[PDB]
């Protein structure tokens, strides 16, 4: 917006008193309006080059680079939060699986836990004879987990756990009826 400053010095910068309908001032102010609007747009353009301050189209460009695609009616703030969370996903532990379930079902108040049967392997000394422990075999074995879920689910949640669980661990999924009643 240095258009008047860098303009030819002899040209008038001010609407002349002698004529309220001075065409020179009209042309100059028109061009100046467009110069200042382009400067404003160029100053506001910085917000599009940052993930923090990006908006619709450029934010979609960022999500396409990160691999995360906008959902139906998904605004910018929730979308960028979802991208940031997707980058920072903990994986390979019970807490991660529990969060993945709770974030594929609707809510947090549901009971969800992971059972590890290898804790109940029957050792000679410590394990009680008629106790909770069982003899080692196929199910009571390391690299095995059984996930108990306190609500209804699509079968596809199994595939979500396949995305989170560590490689080499057999998965079983237990629906518990006692929550839904």
């Amino acid at each position: 917006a240095n258009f008047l400053k860098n303009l030819h010095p002899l040209l008038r910068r001010d609407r002349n008193k002698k004529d309220n309908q001075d065409p020179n001032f009209a042309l100059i102010d028109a061009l100046n309006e467009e110069m200042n609007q382009v400067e404003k747009d160029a100053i506001e353009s910085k917000l599009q080059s940052s993930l923090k301050t990006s908006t619709s189209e450029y934010l979609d460009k960022f999500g396409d680079w990160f691999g995360v695609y906008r959902k139906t009616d998904e605004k910018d703030d929730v979308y960028r939060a979802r991208i940031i969370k997707y980058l920072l996903l903990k994986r390979g532990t019970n807490n991660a699986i529990i969060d993945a379930i709770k974030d594929y079902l609707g809510r947090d108040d549901i009971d969800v836990s992971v059972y590890e049967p290898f804790t109940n392997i029957f050792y000679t000394n410590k394990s009680h004879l008629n106790g909770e422990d069982h003899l080692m075999g196929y199910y009571y074995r390391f690299a095995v987990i059984n996930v108990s879920i306190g609500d209804y689910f699509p079968v596809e949640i199994i595939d979500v756990i396949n995305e989170f669980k560590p490689a080499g661990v057999t998965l079983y999924v237990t629906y518990d009826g006692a929550s839904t009643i």
Partner: protein, 348 residues
């Protein structure tokens, strides 16, 4: 950038110009005012377009810079040369690194050399060595039987041959291929998952594909280079790269894919018999090599697919095709792959 267009900018300029003065009322084509405002608005439009393009370029550049995810350069070709001697060697012979290998086939004048020192044991009749193309890019992907000369000059050498077509030479990484590897990075930030294991195995640039085969308490990573082999150095490197990504406490093993080595002999009839020669044979052989060496892990080989691929070269010039070694499709398992053996063509 709001992506304005020329017509709106010109209309806004003309409207303001009219509003500032009632004297100016001639904005027809060919007028001075209209031309000046048109030029200004056109330049503004070009500024906006280029600003949008530069912002797109800046987003790609900041993605590259933030993670230091540098884009893959061209890879130089490499492969295995076999050698035979006159008689079983009486002694430990030597072949130093930089020993050059060349080919008398003028169609493939590229040069190769050893990057490693070699020796042979007493009472051995042949040896295998790995050689790298001196020149980078696709030029070092010579067919089988090309390399037949050794520049060491040693007398005990009877003959030299590359038993298989080289396929490891490649140009700069494509835009979509780079974009797909970055998605794998993002997924593999969680270290202990199957996709993270696959990324760590793929972290080595030499590795082409990986199939992670999963069992209870055991992981088997089937990996291969762009030729279908898996050298011990490459296996060790994959292992070292997987130390950071593999889950703790679970057994892991790295092994080479179940490579199948399809030899082909094709009898092809030609309608225009003048066109018969060495050029057409070599072109057909090249097409077959490119078809087979583009098969991925677990791609079945379908004889009719190969038939259409050969016949689409020229559907008029080529009359009929017949295979003298293949009669039924080949099933490839998940951990398997197909690669071209000797490719031969008889023109009739």
């Amino acid at each position: 950038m709001k992506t304005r267009k020329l017509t709106n900018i010109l209309s806004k300029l003309i409207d303001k110009t009219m509003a500032g003065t009632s004297k100016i009322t001639d904005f027809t084509p060919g007028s001075a005012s209209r031309s000046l405002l048109e030029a200004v608005s056109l330049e503004i439009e070009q500024f906006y377009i280029l600003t949008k393009e530069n912002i797109d370029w800046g987003i790609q550049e900041g993605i590259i810079e933030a993670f230091d995810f540098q884009k893959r350069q061209s890879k130089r070709a490499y492969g295995d040369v076999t050698i035979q001697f006159y008689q079983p060697l009486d002694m430990r012979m030597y072949i130093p690194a930089g020993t050059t290998f060349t080919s008398t086939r003028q169609e493939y004048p590229q040069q190769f050399e050893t990057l490693v020192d070699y020796y042979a044991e007493p009472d051995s009749t042949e040896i295998v060595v790995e050689v790298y193309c001196k020149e980078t890019g696709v030029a070092g992907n010579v067919p089988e039987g090309t390399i037949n000369t050794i520049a060491s000059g040693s007398s005990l050498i009877r003959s030299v041959n590359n038993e298989y077509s080289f396929n490891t030479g490649t140009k700069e990484e494509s835009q979509e291929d780079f974009k797909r590897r970055f998605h794998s990075f993002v997924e593999s930030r969680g270290r202990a998952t199957n996709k993270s294991v696959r990324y760590g195995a793929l972290q080595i640039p030499d590795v082409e594909g990986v199939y992670v085969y999963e069992e209870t308490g055991h992981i088997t990573v089937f990996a291969h280079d762009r030729n279908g082999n898996l050298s011990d150095t490459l296996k060790e490197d994959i292992i070292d790269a997987l130390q950071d990504y593999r889950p703790s406490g679970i057994m892991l093993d790295v092994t080479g894919v179940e490579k199948e080595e399809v030899n082909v002999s094709a009898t092809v009839t030609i309608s225009n018999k003048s066109r018969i020669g060495d050029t057409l044979q070599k072109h057909i052989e090249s097409v077959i090599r490119s078809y087979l060496n583009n098969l991925k892990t677990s791609d079945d080989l379908i004889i009719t697919d190969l038939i259409q691929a050969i016949m689409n070269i020229d559907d008029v010039l080529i009359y009929d095709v017949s295979f003298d070694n293949l009669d039924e499709n080949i099933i490839v398992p998940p951990q398997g792959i197909i690669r071209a053996g000797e490719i031969k063509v008889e023109l009739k």
